[model samples]
Target: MVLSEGEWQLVLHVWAKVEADVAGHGQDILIRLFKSHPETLEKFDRFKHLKTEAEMKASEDLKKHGVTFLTALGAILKKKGHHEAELKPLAQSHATKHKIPIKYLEFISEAIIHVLHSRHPGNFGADAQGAMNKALELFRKDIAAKYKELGYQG
Candidate 1:
């Protein structure tokens, strides 16, 4: 779904908080994803032994990838829902260079907004949730397109 002008404002408004402490929040979102979907745990070998949120949070390795993860989100949002530059290579890597399933992007997006709600409870309400969902949905479409293009169904 294309985003409404209203939706862009709603999402970009809270995005500031994310940009303010990119790594910290990135770390948080990744932890939440792993916690909520522990099945995705082995998808990241570096995070393999992180048995709990506490262990995940304490990971230096996770912090590095955490920046990579969240900054990747910023690239998509900044491109106004396109995956041309920021996500194209990334999607290719997730597919060809690595075998990460594109479905995990959904898990990452869910964890993203969940962390946003934690960061700004008063700001994020019903409409904002819908907006973020709309925007993130655009990404999975974009990502999977490249995934298939590169000869990786995942």
Candidate 2:
């Protein structure tokens, strides 16, 4: 629920770099997610047809949606803790509106971590990655619980 000051420091250090180009990094994360789990794209009707890596990369909607994710993540990370309430609407939309499986969100979390490391190697040290792991674990659990609460069955 709480990110230790050490944890925040590590993550924030890396995030500061990621913040510079959230659009680029966010899309990169999506590119990874799409490649890793193509089924995820099915949720984004506009992007499902963008099969090729280059195509997805070039898709404006892809960037738009990707930015939406990073924007929310950035907001959440900036908050002290107790992000459950903020996560509720997102979980509801993903579960009900998007009807996406939690699997894709899992992929997104991994993709964020993976993409951040690749894009900001200098900032994304092992300790930062460890902090991100903890942060993402909460993100996943909160959404997972919300999905089940909303009767999506996770």
Candidate 3:
């Protein structure tokens, strides 16, 4: 799927908010995901012991780790298809090492969409939400293909 010019614009605009507070927003999204999907939290040893969102937010290790993923995500989104080559290896690693199922990726995309809408209630319209969803859908497809290629069943 291709992002239209307008879609790209909307993606970039919402991404800016994510960029402004990478650690805060990224950790917030992840915390939301973990709350919604406890199984996902079980995968991360660092977060497995955490009991609440506030606890997760207070962890320096969690915040730093979250920033790295968010930074990479921002880079991947910013450069469009250019980062696929780089992202594929990470996807394979996630499948192989982390055993992150495709559903977790979907949760991530949904969390991002939620963050964008919450951050910019007025600016994030249906079209913008659709654009972001499409972007993540494409990203997930690429990651899924790599996951399969690596012989991962998860």
Least well predicted 10-residue stretch by lDDT in candidate 3: 80-89
What is the lDDT for 52 in model 2? 97
lDDT of 3 at 104: 86
Taking the tens digit of each residue's C-alpha lDDT, what string does model 3 give over 60-146? 988888898898888888877566677876886798888888988998888878877888887789988898898889888888788
When summed lDDT is taken over every stretch of 10 residues in candidate 2, the lowest stretch is: 76-85
Please give the lDDT score for candidate 2: 0.83
Q: Global CA lDDT of candidate 3, please?
A: 0.83
Residue 109's lDDT within candidate 2 is: 85
For every model in order, what is the number of clashing pairs? 0, 0, 0
lDDT value, residue 77 of candidate 3? 89
Better of 1 and 3 by TM-score: 3
| Model 1 residue 111 CA deviation in Å | 1.0
Report the alpha-carbon TM-score of model 3 versus the true structure.
Answer: 0.94
Q: Candidate 2 on 37-127: residue-level lDDT in tens?
A: 8777777767767869989878888899888989999888877466766888888887898888877767788888888888778888888
Question: Each candidate's lDDT (Cα)?
Answer: 0.82, 0.83, 0.83
How do the candidates rank by TM-score, highest first? Answer: 3, 2, 1
Q: Rank order by lDDT, top first?
A: 3, 2, 1
